[PDB]
A paper describes a structure:
PROPPIN (β-propellers that bind polyphosphoinositides) proteins are phosphoinositide effectors that play prominent roles in autophagosome biogenesis. PROPPINs adopt a seven-bladed β-propeller fold, in which the two neighboring sites in blades 5–6 contribute to the binding of phosphoinositides. PROPPINs can also function as scaffolds to integrate the phosphoinositide signaling with other regulators for controlling autophagy. In this study, we determine the structure of WIPI3 in complex with the WIR-peptide from ATG2A.
Author numbering:
A (entry chain A): 9 to 263, 270 to 311
B (entry chain B): 1378 to 1399
The structure:
C-alpha cells in the first residue's frame, strides 16, 4: 500500500505516503515515529521539515496540498490547485508547490498567499530542491530549456537567475547538499552525474556510472559533501568520492531511495517493495549488509 | 488561481525536535 517515500532535509528521517494515510520513520536507527491511518484518500507525497511538527501532504487525486500539524493531529492549511501537484518543498518561511509545468511559492503562515510563479519544462517527476538553511534560500529546478537547471535565490528574487547547462537531454534526478552549496544532477541517460557550485553554477566534479544506460532513482550527499550515493533501476546503489581531483568511478556498490546514515561509513536504502537496508563500508569500498527489515511491518 | 483555505485560528509555530531521535 506504499505510494511514496522521501528523506527529510538532513536524511535524519523519512516519511511514506500510503493509500491509507502516511507514516514517519527515524532513518538510523530504523524507528517508526508516527502513523496516521486516518486519511481515506491516502497521500501521494509527503514533505517534512527537519524534525518539526508539520508535514506537507499531497491529497488523493494530487490536486490539493494539506499542511498537517502533528502536535494538533489536524490539517491546519489546505491549498487546492487545478493541476496535479507533483511535489512539495518546505522551509521555515516558504511552501513550494511543484506542478508539472510550473513552480508556485507561498508564504508559510496560518493563511498563505502566493509570492512567485516559476515556469519549468515538463516536470512529471516533480524535480525540485530547496535549501532550508536560515542563510540560504536557494530554489532549483528544471529550466524551460531541456536539461538546464535554473537556480533562484528566494531571499533575493529581484536578481537574474543562474542557469546551469547541466545536461543536453531530460533531467531525471537533482539533489542538494546539506550546506546548500552543491547540486548534483543526472539525465535520463544516467551515464554522468555532474556536481555544480550553487552560487556560480560552474562544474565541480563529474562522475561516471557507466557507458551503458541505467535510470537513476536517487542521489544524496553526505554531511560534508565528500561522498555521494546513487541508486539505479536494476536494484543497484553506488557510492562515489565527490571531491576527488579527477573524474572517478564508483568507490563501492551494492544491491529505491538512498542516503548516508548516522555513522560516516554507513549508507541506508529504502525500497518501493517495503525493504529497508543499512550497509557499512570501508575506506577501500567493502560493503557489508548490517540491517534488513520490512519497515512497513 | 489556486484556492487557499485556512482551517485553524492560531499562528503557525515551528516546533523543532518534535520527531525526536530514539
Amino acid at each position: 500500500g506504499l505510494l511514496y517515500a522521501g528523506f527529510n532535509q538532513d536524511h535524519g528521517c523519512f516519511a511514506c505516503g500510503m493509500e491509507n494515510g502516511f507514516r514517519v520513520y527515524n532513518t538510523d536507527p530504523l524507528k517508526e515515529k508516527e502513523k496516521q491511518e486516518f486519511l481515506e484518500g491516502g497521500v501521494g507525497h509527503v514533505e517534512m521539515l527537519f524534525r518539526c511538527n508539520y508535514l506537507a501532504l499531497v491529497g488523493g487525486g494530487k490536486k490539493k496540498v494539506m499542511i498537517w500539524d502533528d502536535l494538533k493531529k489536524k490539517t491546519v492549511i489546505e491549498i487546492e490547485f487545478s493541476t496535479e501537484v507533483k511535489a512539495v518543498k518546505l522551509r521555515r518561511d516558504r511552501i513550494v508547490v511543484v506542478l508539472d509545468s510550473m513552480i508556485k511559492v507561498f508564504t508559510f503562515t496560518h493563511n498563505p498567499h502566493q509570492l512567485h510563479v516559476f515556469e519549468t519544462c515538463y516536470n512529471p517527476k516533480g524535480l525540485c530542491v530547496l535549501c532550508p538553511n536560515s542563510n540560504n534560500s536557494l530554489l532549483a529546478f528544471p529550466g524551460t530549456h531541456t536539461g538546464h537547471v535554473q537556480l533562484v535565490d528566494l531571499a533575493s528574487t529581484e536578481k537574474p537567475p543562474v542557469d546551469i547547462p547541466a545536461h543536453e537531454g531530460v533531467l531525471s534526478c537533482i539533489a542538494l547538499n546539506l550546506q546548500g552549496t552543491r547540486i548534483a544532477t543526472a539525465s535520463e541517460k544516467g551515464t554522468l552525474i555532474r556536481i555544480f557550485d550553487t552560487s556560480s553554477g560552474h562544474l565541480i566534479q563529474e562522475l561516471r556510472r557507466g557507458s551503458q544506460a541505467a535510470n537513476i532513482y536517487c542521489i544524496n550527499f553526505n554531511q560534508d559533501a565528500s561522498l555521494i550515493c546513487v541508486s539505479s533501476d536494476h536494484g543497484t546503489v553506488h557510492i562515489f568520492a565527490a571531491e576527488d581531483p579527477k573524474s572517478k568511478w564508483s568507490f563501492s556498490k551494492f544491491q529505491c531511495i538512498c542516503a548516508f546514515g548516522t555513522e560516516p561509513n554507513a549508507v541506508i536504502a529504502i525500497c518501493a517493495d517495503g525493504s529497508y537496508y543499512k550497509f557499512l563500508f570501508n575506506p577501500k569500498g567493502e560493503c557489508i549488509r548490517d540491517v534488513y527489515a520490512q519497515f512497513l511491518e
